[PDB]
Amino acid sequence: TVVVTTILESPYVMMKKNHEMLEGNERYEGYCVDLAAEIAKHCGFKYK
Amino acid sequence: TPKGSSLGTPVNLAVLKLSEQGVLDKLKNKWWYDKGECGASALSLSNVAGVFYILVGGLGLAMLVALIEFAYK
Amino acid sequence: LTIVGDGKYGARDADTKIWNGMVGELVYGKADIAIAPLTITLVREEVIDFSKPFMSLGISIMIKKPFLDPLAYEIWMAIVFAYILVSVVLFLVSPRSLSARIVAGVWWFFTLIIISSYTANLAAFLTVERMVSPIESAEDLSKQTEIAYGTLDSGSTKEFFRRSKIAVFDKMWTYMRSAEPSVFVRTTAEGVARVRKSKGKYAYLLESTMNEYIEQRKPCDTMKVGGNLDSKGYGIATPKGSSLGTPVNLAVLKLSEQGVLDKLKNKWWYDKGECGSKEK
Amino acid sequence: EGVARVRKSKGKYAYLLESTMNEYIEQRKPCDTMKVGGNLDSKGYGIATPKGSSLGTPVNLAVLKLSEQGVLDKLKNKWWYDKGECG
Amino acid sequence: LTIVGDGKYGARDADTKIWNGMVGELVYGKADIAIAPLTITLVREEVI
Amino acid sequence: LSARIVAGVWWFFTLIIISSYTANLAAFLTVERMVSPIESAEDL
Amino acid sequence: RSLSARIVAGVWWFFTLIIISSYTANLAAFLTVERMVSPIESAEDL
Ligand SMILES: CC(C)S(=O)(=O)NC[C@H](C)c1ccc(-c2ccc([C@@H](C)CNS(=O)(=O)C(C)C)cc2)cc1
Numbered sequence: 001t002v003v004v005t006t007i008l009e010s011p012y013v014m015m016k017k018n019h020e021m022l023e024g025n026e027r028y029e030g031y032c033v034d035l036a037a038e039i040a041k042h043c044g045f046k047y048k
Numbered sequence: 049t050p051k052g053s054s055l056g057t058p059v060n061l062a063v064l065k066l067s068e069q070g071v072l073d074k075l076k077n078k079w080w081y082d083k084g085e086c087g088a089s090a091l092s093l094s095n096v097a098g099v100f101y102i103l104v105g106g107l108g109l110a111m112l113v114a115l116i117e118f119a120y121k
Numbered sequence: 122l123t124i125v126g127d128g129k130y131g132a133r134d135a136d137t138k139i140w141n142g143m144v145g146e147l148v149y150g151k152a153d154i155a156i157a158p159l160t161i162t163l164v165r166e167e168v169i170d171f172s173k174p175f176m177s178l179g180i181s182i183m184i185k186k187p188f189l190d191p192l193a194y195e196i197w198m199a200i201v202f203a204y205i206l207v208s209v210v211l212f213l214v215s216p217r218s219l220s221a222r223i224v225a226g227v228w229w230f231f232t233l234i235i236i237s238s239y240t241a242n243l244a245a246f247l248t249v250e251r252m253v254s255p256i257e258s259a260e261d262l263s264k265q266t267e268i269a270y271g272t273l274d275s276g277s278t279k280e281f282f283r284r285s286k287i288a289v290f291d292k293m294w295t296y297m298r299s300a301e302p303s304v305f306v307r308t309t310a311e312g313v314a315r316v317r318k319s320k321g322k323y324a325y326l327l328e329s330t331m332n333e334y335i336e337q338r339k340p341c342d343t344m345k346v347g348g349n350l351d352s353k354g355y356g357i358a359t360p361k362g363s364s365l366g367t368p369v370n371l372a373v374l375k376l377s378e379q380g381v382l383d384k385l386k387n388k389w390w391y392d393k394g395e396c397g398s399k400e401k
Numbered sequence: 402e403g404v405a406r407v408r409k410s411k412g413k414y415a416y417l418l419e420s421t422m423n424e425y426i427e428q429r430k431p432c433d434t435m436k437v438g439g440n441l442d443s444k445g446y447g448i449a450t451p452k453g454s455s456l457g458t459p460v461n462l463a464v465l466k467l468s469e470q471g472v473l474d475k476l477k478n479k480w481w482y483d484k485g486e487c488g
Numbered sequence: 489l490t491i492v493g494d495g496k497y498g499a500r501d502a503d504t505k506i507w508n509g510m511v512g513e514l515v516y517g518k519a520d521i522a523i524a525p526l527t528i529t530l531v532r533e534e535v536i
Numbered sequence: 537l538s539a540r541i542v543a544g545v546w547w548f549f550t551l552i553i554i555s556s557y558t559a560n561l562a563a564f565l566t567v568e569r570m571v572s573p574i575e576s577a578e579d580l
Numbered sequence: 581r582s583l584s585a586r587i588v589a590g591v592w593w594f595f596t597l598i599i600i601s602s603y604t605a606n607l608a609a610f611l612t613v614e615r616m617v618s619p620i621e622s623a624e625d626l
């Protein structure tokens with residue numbers, strides 16, 4: 001899967017409040033997370 | 049993207065695609081001004097003092113003009 | 122007439138999946154019909170039959186209600202000390218001498234400024250009261266901090282926020298669930314009392330009907346602000362398959378068309394009201 | 402026809418109509434009409450099925466589902482105050 | 489989607505006792521459902 | 537009488553002036569707000 | 581200073597008082613209005 005590197009700068013990439021009870025790319029939320037999802041959509045790849 | 053990436057051009061095209069579709073603006077508003085917690089007669093008690101300074105000062109000048117006036121003789 | 126045993130409207134515990142309250146009394150056959158301010162919901166409609174609604178409402182926001190004022194209390198004093206200080210300088214001067222004359226000029230400019238400030242600020246103050254509001258919109262209220270806000274422990278208001286997938290309401294539910302100390306109250310009276318005793322630090326989310334009612338009741342210190350969050354209505358509920366369902370429904374809309382329901386609403390809301398006159 | 406009569410009677414004719422259409426025309430060209438006073442009564446529009454229809458109950462459930470999901474409100478805003486030309 | 493034939497909402501003539509409009513189309517089976525600004529009345533709730 | 541007509545014109549002038557001050561100050565107290573000095577980067 | 585002339589000075593004074601007060605008030609209102617955002621500026625409104 002495509003490895004995406006990003007940085008923990010709010011509010012671009014943030015740890016979800018319940019990140020401890022979560023795993024994978026569900027741990028993160030933010031502008032760049034949603035942007036990563038959209039880029040994945042229009043380029044047609046899975047990402048990590 | 050690492051230069052020479054097979055992902056470079058489609059990612060770029062995707063970015064400007066998202067920009068033109070209003071997606072990027074919508075996301076900006078979503079994380080900036082939607083989750084924003086601060087969004088945005090009584091009396092002025094200090095300002096009048098600024099006039100008082102010109103009042104008292106003028107009175108001081110007047111006091112002086114009074115003294116010198118009675119001082120001519 | 123009987124009062125519901127557990128004093129609840131009705132819901133299913135997410136574990137036991139048992140219905141409580143009046144809906145519970147209907148489903149489990151403890152009562153033959155429910156006539157109360159029972160809000161019509163999807164899940165309630167799934168287990169009982171609702172008559173056409175007899176009263177319309179919506180979830181709304183309740184807050185605590187909110188001549189020498191234009192000029193600060195300190196300046197009214199300063200005007201007096203300046204008055205005696207000018208009368209004392211003039212007393213020290215004693216047609217007229219030119220210096221004594223200029224004193225009157227500076228004092229004239231001073232009082233000109235004072236009265237102009239009073240007039241302007243009073244103009245703002247009078248324009249502002251009709252115009253002025255702490256928070257008008259629901260989203261704005263959600264955005265504001267230090268003014269905590271909450272709902273009843275059980276009911277459609279709380280469940281509305283729990284289910285709502287719409288941005289602002291989702292944010293508000295996310296806030297309420299984590300809020301400390303708890304922002305939820307057990308009775309409407311408790312919520313309104315909390316509004317009155319938080320001095321504007323707490324807003325209460327409740328159906329428009331109760332809000333409008335309390336707005337008219339002593340000591341008339343609460344106010345309904347903004348519009349409504351959603352729009353729904355109360356209906357008379359029958360156990361589904363009841364022999365009373367269709368005639369009760371027909372009776373409800375009969376009463377609605379004959380002006381009976383409007384008459385009862387005015388009777389108990391705005392006729393016994395002790396105070397909705399806003400004047401800009 | 403009623404609204405046209407209002408516009409062409411120059412204040413000599415008032416039109417009694419449901420609040421919905423009134424609110425709609427209030428937002429429409431040439432924005433020369435106005436809703437005045439409150440309402441005379443309070444009622445609502447509903448989806449009607451022939452009694453005994455196999456479609457009745459799911460449609461009803463669908464309506465209140467849409468109401469709770471904010472769908473109905475969103476549509477109301479869509480056709481009334483979004484396309485509104487004087488809002 | 490079909491537009492009601494006589495362009496009426498519905499009522500019963502007190503002589504013919506026939507329903508017109510969309511209610512009429514429902515009662516007499518000319519349509520399967522009515523989705524319109526149809527105001528809820530007592531007499532209509534009695535037949536649909 | 538020249539001094540009188542002067543006093544009249546000047547009176548109308550100062551009347552307009554103070555009226556403008558009062559009105560504009562009323563608009564200024566009814567609307568807007570100022571908090572920060574707006575300090576230029578070079579000034580900082 | 582005839583009494584009739586005096587009442588003239590009083591009524592005329594009240595008159596000009598009303599006038600300058602009205603001019604001030606209305607000018608203040610006009611300036612307050614201008615402070616309010618224009619309808620034209622909004623896109624949806626345009
Ligand atoms: C649960 C929701 C589907 S809902 O509340 O039923 N409808 C949602 C929608 C916003 C709505 C909300 C409220 C009402 C509504 C309108 C009027 C009344 C009273 C005045 C009379 N009821 S009636 O049915 O119109 C009458 C002819 C008897 C009671 C409720 C109508 C529609």
Ligand SMILES: N[C@@H](Cn1cc(F)c(=O)[nH]c1=O)C(=O)O
Nearest residue numbers: 130159160276277278309327328
């Ligand atoms: N009426 C609701 C219960 N209920 C009562 C209230 F007074 C209120 O403010 N909110 C609420 O959900 C229901 O039917 O469950």
Ligand SMILES: N[C@@H](Cn1cc(F)c(=O)[nH]c1=O)C(=O)O
Nearest residue numbers: 417418419422497498525526527
């Ligand atoms: N909606 C009504 C018919 N109907 C339509 C209108 F446009 C109106 O102004 N009044 C009215 O009664 C019905 O269902 O019969």
